[PDB]
Amino acid sequence: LTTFTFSGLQDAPVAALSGSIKLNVAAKAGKAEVTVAAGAAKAATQVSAAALRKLSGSKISLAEVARISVLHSSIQNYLLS
Amino acid sequence: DRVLSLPAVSKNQVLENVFHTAPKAPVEHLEKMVSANSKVYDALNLQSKRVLIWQVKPALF
């Protein structure tokens, strides 16, 4: 990812596509009332338009924990396949 | 020559032509597939102590 990202609360996903998790956002001009519902649990917070923009500030940068290496595990997954 | 009126095929040659092959046990299919499916359990279960799921699809952390 780059240093500056320009997405969040504009042209966003408004609703979920599955039934396994129920998403409901309510966008005003400034903030948004998101309502998430997964399983028995529920949560609903207020995400500002400048709260999603600070999300991509410090990146996650996922990386694979392999037994030997990612190369070897992809060959061994093919031999298992 | 009374022995030439006895059946010339021995009692030995009957017991080796009637019992020619050692027969397959009923339990040797169980205890040979079970020991081979215990390796299918080990490698491929998700509750085994030696699963291959972290060796073939390394986890994204």
Automatic annotation (TrEMBL), chain A:
It comes from the Eukaryota. This is Mitochondrial ATP synthase associated protein ASA7. It comes from Polytomella sp. Pringsheim 198.80. The lineage of its organism: Eukaryota, Viridiplantae, Chlorophyta, core chlorophytes, Chlorophyceae.
TrEMBL record, chain B:
It comes from the Eukaryota. This is Mitochondrial F1F0 ATP synthase associated 14 kDa protein. The chain holds residues 63 to 123 of 123 of the full protein. The gene is asa5.
